[PDB]
Design a protein around this ligand. Structure first.
Ligand code: Y01
Ligand code: Y01
Ligand code: Y01
Ligand code: Y01
Ligand code: R16
Ligand code: C14
Length: 596
């Protein structure tokens, strides 16, 4: 027993594996009786302070809670920062796109409806597949994290919980109409900003094991020790015993991390492909009013930064200090937060984490069910199958396109849990697959010299050129090609960078040769005023760029001279983390109540 505080663990090969905390009755009632319960609850109840809450609501997926801590268990303190740093980029790209949607195409319901107008019907069917693949990739990795936490904490069979989760979201979507309400989007941002405060104040303030920022420091300095022998009876391969490979001096408390720095690039490339190629973002930008409220997107983006930052800094750095025997596979599957929650407050932190996770799963898997349904009913039914009917049919074949997707996703989730895919491989592989269609979409709304064949070729060749590099680098640097060598940070960076850049270069070189000068006169008709929509854009591209350059660039640069953090500097980091996540938890729960 190397340490006196972790002696009941002596070393195991995994934290989980037997004697589940909860019983199957609790697990079979949460995956099936949460969407229905909230559907009845919302029907029981009949500004720039209510736009921030709705903005925060749809941006919280099941990966925000589970992967931010996965990249904090490795790399130390650079993980949560590099994960959360992609926050002002989204707000800038959402504002500057919601302005142009209102200015150049007011009567559209889907992104692929502005594609058939600008360009032809041959570049429509390519992006109609490149958009339907993103709704599959994102929906398939909140059924991978949801079905692993439930099986771990409770004991429900994972193949039987992968098929019952989508059916609890289909009921929630069908009930309450296939539309969003400002009342149901306010109760979702209240529950997730209460568990955040509870978990942050339990780790650095109150717990009888990890109680102060000066205990985490002394316990994270002892894990990375050069005199710690952990060959075969005192650790295993991927169990995080000693010095970190790639960190300055092997320390967890440093911002000089290379593995954590390349994940920032991967995260940036991956997050650009979900605000452009995902129709769920276009649906929620069409239904906004930038002219009336546009300062509510910055306040709804500066508060979301504290959710993956504070919670990860607590729940991922409190697992290293407690010496839990978490293996690498379990950490990948999304099992660090439930590992810390049982260790700190067992049988009661596990019910709080389940509620916080399934309040995000059910509220983010309903935004994809109404994004695939619209992309079907408005684009493959009333464009090509039957364009002469609009009465009572548009609704039937919109309600019937949710049930089909909720079953296809359920079957595909069963198929990918048998194989062995884990959020953590799908999260990193998103860019390699759908990054080639990002710039051909920005050029559609922002550039007046972009043609159709260039878009087709740039979208359809970048994917192949990215996958070839992604599968080649792993083969030439690791021997074989399987789920292990492919998920490394080497191949994935090459794949992401090739995919995003080649599809932009090919499209922007082939368009300066044969330009199509477009006045947007065809997208403006599909089915004062300009002064406000010109000052709003001026405000956004200034006050979003300032914060982007201030957070992504200046803040990490000034932390490099700190080298290994010293007691007193970690007290500053661990206090910024608590302050952001506390003063962000009042402006969401009390500001949209100063309506009075
Ligand atoms: C704005 C963010 C999202 C991206 C910023 C990009 C660059 C500023 C970063 C990204 C990857 C970084 C590199 C990641 C890894 C290394 C290896 C590292 O090599 C070593 O010193 C370790 C080698 C050894 O000692 O064996 C030197 C810095 C370098 C090139 C880093 C330099 C800074 C880079 C290029
Ligand atoms: C995990 C360890 C053991 C291996 C680490 C390997 C990486 C550090 C190397 C291997 C292959 C390299 C890549 C090979 C090819 C490219 C493509 C290149 O991108 C372009 O050429 C884009 C421009 C265009 O194609 O238009 C940028 C460098 C990059 C990502 C290289 C970056 C460094 C990589 C990822
Ligand atoms: C645009 C140009 C003109 C200025 C860019 C500013 C920064 C990007 C540079 C300027 C000084 C640099 C620092 C100069 C010295 C070091 C010490 C160096 O420490 C070591 O690794 C050596 C210590 C040891 O191994 O004993 C780490 C990088 C750092 C902080 C450098 C990080 C990058 C800094 C902040
Ligand atoms: C040559 C070796 C043996 C010694 C190297 C010492 C430097 C690495 C240290 C010593 C004093 C330090 C400086 C002490 C005070 C400042 C002022 C500070 O600037 C401000 O506060 C400007 C803002 C304002 O005053 O409004 C920025 C850091 C800096 C340059 C520090 C940078 C790092 C310095 C130069
Ligand atoms: C002692 C073992 C090797 C230590 C090498 C550490 C390299 C750290 C480089 C990563 C720093 C990138 C900062 C980027 C900020 C914009
Ligand atoms: C032991 C070797 C340490 C090397 C550290 C290199 C740090 C370079 C960071 C510079 C990034 C500047 C981005 C603008």
């Amino acid at each position: 027993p190397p340490f006196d505080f972790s002696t009941k663990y002596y070393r195991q090969s995994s934290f989980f594996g037997g004697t589940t905390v909860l019983d199957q009755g609790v697990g079979y009632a949460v995956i099936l009786g949460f969407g229905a319960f909230f559907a009845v609850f919302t029907s029981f109840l009949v500004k720039t302070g209510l736009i921030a809450s709705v903005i925060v609501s749809q941006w919280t997926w099941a990966a925000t809670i589970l992967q931010s801590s996965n990249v904090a268990w490795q790399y130390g303190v650079s993980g949560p920062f590099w994960y959360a740093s992609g926050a002002t980029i989204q707000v800038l790209l959402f504002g500057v796109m919601a302005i142009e949607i209102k200015r150049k195409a007011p009567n559209a319901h889907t992104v692929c409806e502005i594609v058939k107008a600008r360009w032809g019907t041959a570049t429509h069917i390519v992006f109609l597949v490149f958009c339907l693949a993103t709704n599959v990739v994102v929906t398939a990795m909140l059924l991978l994290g949801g079905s692993a936490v439930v099986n771990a904490l409770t004991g429900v069979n994972l193949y039987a919980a992968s098929f019952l989760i989508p059916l609890g979201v289909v009921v929630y979507t069908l009930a309450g109409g296939l539309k969003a309400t400002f009342l149901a989007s306010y109760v979702h941002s209240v529950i997730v900003h209460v568990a955040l405060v509870v978990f942050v104040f339990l780790v650095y303030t109150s717990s009888k094991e990890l109680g102060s920022p000066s205990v985490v420091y002394d316990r994270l300095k002892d894990m990375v020790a050069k005199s710690r022998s952990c060959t075969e009876p005192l650790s295993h391969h991927g169990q995080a015993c000693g010095p970190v490979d790639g960190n300055f001096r092997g320390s967890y408390l440093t911002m000089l991390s290379s593995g954590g720095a390349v994940f920032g690039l991967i995260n940036i490339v991956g997050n650009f492909g979900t605000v452009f190629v995902d129709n769920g973002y276009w649906v929620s930008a069409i239904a906004a009013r930038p002219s009336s409220t546009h300062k509510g997107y910055l306040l709804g983006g500066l508060v979301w930064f504290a959710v993956p930052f504070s919670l990860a800094t607590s729940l991922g750095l409190g697992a290293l200090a407690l010496d839990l025997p978490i293996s690498k596979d379990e950490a990948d599957r999304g099992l660090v937060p439930p590992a810390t929650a049982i260790a700190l407050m067992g049988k009661s932190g596990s019910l709080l984490l389940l509620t916080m996770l399934f309040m995000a799963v059910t509220s983010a898997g309903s935004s994809e069910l109404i994004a695939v349904s619209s992309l079907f009913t408005y684009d493959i039914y009333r464009t090509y199958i039957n364009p002469r009917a609009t009465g009572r049919q548009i609704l039937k074949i919109s309600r019937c396109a949710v049930l089909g997707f909720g079953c296809f996703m359920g079957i595909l989730a069963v198929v990918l849990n048998k194989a062995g895919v884990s959020l953590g491989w799908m999260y990193l592989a998103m860019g390699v697959l759908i990054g080639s269609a990002v710039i051909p979409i920005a050029f559609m709304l922002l550039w007046s010299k972009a043609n159709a064949f260039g878009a087709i070729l740039g979208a359809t060749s970048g994917c192949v050129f990215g996958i070839i590099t992604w599968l080649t680098t792993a083969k030439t640097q690791y021997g074989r090609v399987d789920l292990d060598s492919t998920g490394k940070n080497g191949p994935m960076l090459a794949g992401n960078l090739v995919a995003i850049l080649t599809g932009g270069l090919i499209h922007a070189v082939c368009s300066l040769v044969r330009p199509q000068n477009y006045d947007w006169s065809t997208t403006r008709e599909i089915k004062l005023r300009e002064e406000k929509l010109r000052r709003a854009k001026a405000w956004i591209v200034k006050w979003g760029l300032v914060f982007t350059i201030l957070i992504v660039v200046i803040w990490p640069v000034l932390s490099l001279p700190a080298r290994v953090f010293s007691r007193g500097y970690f007290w500053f980091w661990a206090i910024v983390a608590i302050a952001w996540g506390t003063i962000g938890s009042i402006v969401i729960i009390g500001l949209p109540l100063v309506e009075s």
